[PDB]
Design a binder for this molecule. Structure first.
Ligand SMILES: *[C@@H]1O[C@H](CO)[C@@H](O[C@@H]2O[C@H](CO)[C@@H](O)[C@H](O)[C@H]2NC(C)=O)[C@H](O[C@@H]2O[C@@H](C)[C@@H](O)[C@@H](O)[C@@H]2O)[C@H]1NC(C)=O
Ligand SMILES: *[C@@H]1O[C@H](CO)[C@@H](O[C@@H]2O[C@H](CO)[C@@H](O)[C@H](O)[C@H]2NC(C)=O)[C@H](O[C@@H]2O[C@@H](C)[C@@H](O)[C@@H](O)[C@@H]2O)[C@H]1NC(C)=O
Ligand SMILES: [Co+2]
Ligand SMILES: [Co+2]
Ligand SMILES: [N+]
Ligand SMILES: [N+]
Ligand SMILES: [N+]
Lengths: 182, 183
């Protein structure tokens, strides 16, 4: 079986539980994850961004299949959402999609949950071990049937024209640790 | 008070207890610390090197002042040694010195403990927080009087001509975590 993902305290990361997802590297690159709109006058729609000032907002992982031990494991497709309320008309779940002002594929909100065909895989992410203590990266490469529209890639930070730290699909990966919220 | 140094399990690092001192970064940069000679036919004297293949050899920190709670704290001068036996006629304690064949100041064996003579400060190291989870660097800059011979600097890894991974004083710092050997 794939290895369990562990949190910063070495305990298994679990589905249905709030975690902060926080940069493993401190300083300029430090910060957890939150949401923000395009960055100009429009408030909506939202994408996933890095907050440089704090550990960000709580995130919950949801399993695709029934996972009886409730443990999140390496390189298994899963769903991701922020456990917060927002004022845009969309879910708080992550997906890969086009986002205005950003070339390429962005991690946005408005994601779906579960498998129900090709497009639902655009809401599936994998968590893989990275090269720092207790650290992981997000990777997009679903193992469920889908079209070839979105190429497989790691998730990393990209500074947009407003210097908002967007998460996008790209060759390199951002390293994160998981910190149980409570 | 300064914060405790913590080990990879988040427990305070203690004086007089064995730890492996292991690279925070995996892959090519991975491995703990051990000792090796100048790299040619001579076995002696020894310097501190990174073993790329495993967590290395056990290391013990010793306090310079009396530390009642026995906890190693950030930015406090301390002594470092390997808790191993060697076949060179020197102590297993770390110090900064010139080492045969290596340009600049190297972390070698043959160190002293405590504070008798200005030379003994060349065996004093500080552990400072680095920018990765549970990660730290060694910094040489003693807080006790000494000669101006050895400049303050961080400790990092340098591949010598044999590709032996020497620890030297330099601007950049190698990030390490501490793993209790009885774990
Ligand atoms: C998701 O966020 C919710 C909204 O913050 C959390 O529920 C809230 O938890 C508060 C304590 O942190 C408590 O005041 C509120 O009563 C509660 N609000 C509602 C509408 O339930 C929720 O936190 C979890 O669920 C509740 C029932 C408590 O057991 C918390 O300790 C749990 O963390 C967050 N997480 C989940 C998985 O829903
Ligand atoms: C320093 O290294 C010594 C030599 O390896 C350790 O002592 C040895 O520990 C062995 C168990 O790992 C035990 O078989 C040997 O009897 C013992 N050898 C001698 C000469 O004592 C020492 O380990 C600590 O002390 C011993 C007595 C046990 O209590 C161990 O559990 C301790 O870790 C190493 N550490 C120190 C602080 O001396
Ligand atoms: Co070895
Ligand atoms: Co005297
Ligand atoms: N916004
Ligand atoms: N040697
Ligand atoms: N001296």
């Amino acid at each position: 079986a794939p290895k369990p993902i562990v949190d910063i305290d070495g305990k298994p990361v679990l589905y249905g539980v709030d975690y902060f997802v926080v940069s493993a590297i401190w300083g300029a690159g430090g910060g957890g994850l939150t949401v923000y709109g395009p960055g100009n006058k429009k408030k909506c729609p939202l994408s996933v961004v890095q907050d440089p000032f704090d550990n960000g907002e709580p995130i919950i992982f949801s399993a695709i299949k029934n996972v009886k031990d409730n443990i999140v494991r390496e390189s298994v497709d899963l769903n991701v959402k922020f456990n917060i309320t927002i004022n845009c008309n969309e879910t708080t779940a992550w997906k890969v999609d086009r986002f205005p002002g950003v070339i390429g594929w962005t991690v946005t909100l408005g994601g779906e949950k579960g498998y129900h065909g090709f497009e639902s895989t655009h809401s599936m992410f994998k968590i893989k071990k990275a090269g720092l203590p207790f650290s992981y990266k997000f990777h997009f490469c679903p193992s469920y049937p889908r079209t070839r529209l979105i190429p497989c890639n790691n998730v990393d930070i990209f500074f947009d024209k407003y210097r908002i730290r967007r998460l996008i699909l790209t060759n390199d990966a951002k390293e994160f640790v998981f910190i149980k919220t409570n």
